Amino acid sequence: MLKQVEIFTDGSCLGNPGPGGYGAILRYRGREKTFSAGYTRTTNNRMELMAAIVALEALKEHCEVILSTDSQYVRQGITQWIHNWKKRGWKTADKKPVKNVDLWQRLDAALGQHQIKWEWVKGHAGHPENERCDELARAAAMNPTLEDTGYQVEV
């Protein structure tokens, strides 16, 4: 039985925008849960954020998490943007709402309930779990069933 919760995530999209999906693997308690869904029109970035969102939202108690992903967008977000976004009130220098603020706020809310350790893997040097996430994400994008409500050409 593992003493730290392990989450692996990946997101994929066939266009900008186009149909896309995510894959997330969560090793929680003694189970290995797999989440995957496809959306009719979204972006690669929204899908990569959605993967991390659905895995975290599955946790019902405060946990010690290790999250592994090759997503550059989540890493830039987590490492360079989020901190300053919360102080500026989720605005850009020109005072508009940041891009995908809907997902970043949603992720921020989930991150706030846990102790997280981030593992930034390289795309061609991930674990077997990261590869499986890629496969799930690509599969979902091929048969999308949900609407990405939050998507905007806009803001």
Side-chain angles (χ1 to χ4, degrees):
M1 188 160 285
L2 263 185
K3 301 310 302 179
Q4 226 126 101
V5 155
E6 301 181 341
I7 295 177
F8 300 85
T9 56
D10 204 353
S12 203
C13 194
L14 298 164
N16 190 27
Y22 77 67
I25 296 155
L26 170 65
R27 270 203 269 283
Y28 181 47
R29 296 288 263 266
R31 289 213 191 167
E32 190 187 75
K33 259 159 283 206
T34 303
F35 304 86
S36 186
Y39 293 78
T40 70
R41 182 174 181 259
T42 182
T43 60
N44 210 97
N45 289 170
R46 290 186 56 85
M47 288 303 88
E48 292 173 5
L49 268 183
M50 188 70 76
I53 291 160
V54 182
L56 295 162
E57 296 184 344
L59 304 179
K60 307 310 271 175
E61 66 259 21
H62 304 117
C63 317
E64 305 181 14
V65 176
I66 171 166
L67 201 165
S68 173
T69 189
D70 69 352
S71 166
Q72 183 191 207
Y73 179 75
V74 168
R75 175 188 200 216
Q76 269 200 273
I78 292 311
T79 63
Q80 305 164 2
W81 308 337
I82 208 151
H83 189 77
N84 319 267
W85 279 340
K86 271 134 68 71
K87 267 208 203 267
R88 281 213 283 227
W90 298 103
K91 278 146 174 168
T92 66
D94 68 2
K95 290 307 163 178
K96 298 157 81 28
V98 306
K99 207 194 336 87
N100 293 328
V101 56
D102 63 321
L103 299 186
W104 284 119
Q105 286 192 163
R106 182 157 170 197
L107 175 59
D108 174 69
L111 288 182
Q113 304 286 316
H114 306 283
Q115 299 170 69
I116 324 258
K117 155 145 34 149
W118 292 97
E119 192 207 26
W120 313 127
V121 298
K122 278 275 193 182
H124 60 287
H127 308 285
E129 285 87 354
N130 309 92
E131 293 170 56
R132 190 151 80 80
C133 285
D134 186 22
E135 201 182 344
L136 293 152
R138 293 177 285 104
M142 286 301 322
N143 176 229
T145 62
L146 301 171
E147 195 176 342
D148 177 357
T149 239
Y151 175 71
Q152 283 137 226
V153 205
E154 298 71 288
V155 187

